[PDB]
Design a protein around this ligand. Structure first.
Ligand code: RS9
Length: 167
């Protein structure tokens, strides 16, 4: 038993809710919140900009030190950093950005990072400003992630569509 409330159960291990991931993290304090990161950990907009704003830019400060030490992530890769006031940990995961021409097949590799964590609050990778089809992203998520994933979908209209078209 865990504290996520109001989710619709899609599969054995995937749940989904129309929610603001920032508000969900602050209420739930999950062990892991997933950020829709880029390779530079520049949290300017979309989910990343919202999560970072909620941390009063502490996420960005920590991220800049990470990059200065380690260099950029790989597309499809991830790193674990602090969750600040939102979660114990933040798993920064880089899905391919279609608006940068990145290979969509890397989406499966990106979701594989979730399997290193028993339970996660997460957005749909490569959705929103990353330019992928959220329905495809949901399919890859369901077919790749084996751990328990609680997906927060900000847009109500999109949430309903994802549910209604789910196979
Ligand atoms: O853009 C946002 N989320 C979408 C996104 C973005 C980039 C890559 C992605 O893969 C996805 C998928 C994610 C989604 O479909 O839910 C977002 C989420 C919460 C927000 N809270 C505020 C306050 O103003 N702005 C927000 C923006």
């Amino acid at each position: 038993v865990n504290s996520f409330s109001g989710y619709l159960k899609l599969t054995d291990n995937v749940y989904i809710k129309n929610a603001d991931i920032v508000e969900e993290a602050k209420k739930v304090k999950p062990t892991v919140v997933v950020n829709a990161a880029n390779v530079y950990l520049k949290h300017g907009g979309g989910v990343a900009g919202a999560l970072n704003k909620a941390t009063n830019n502490a996420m960005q400060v920590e991220s800049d030190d990470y990059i200065a030490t380690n260099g950029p992530l790989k597309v499809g890769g991830s790193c674990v950093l602090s969750g600040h006031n939102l979660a114990k940990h933040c798993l920064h995961v880089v899905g391919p950005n279609v608006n940068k021409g990145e290979d969509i097949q890397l989406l499966k590799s990106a979701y594989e990072n979730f399997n290193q964590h028993e339970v996660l609050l997460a957005p749909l990778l490569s959705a929103g400003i990353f330019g992928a089809d959220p329905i495809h992203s949901l399919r890859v998520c369901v077919d790749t992630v084996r751990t328990n994933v609680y997906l927060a979908v900000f847009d109500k209209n999109l949430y309903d569509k994802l549910v209604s078209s789910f196979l």
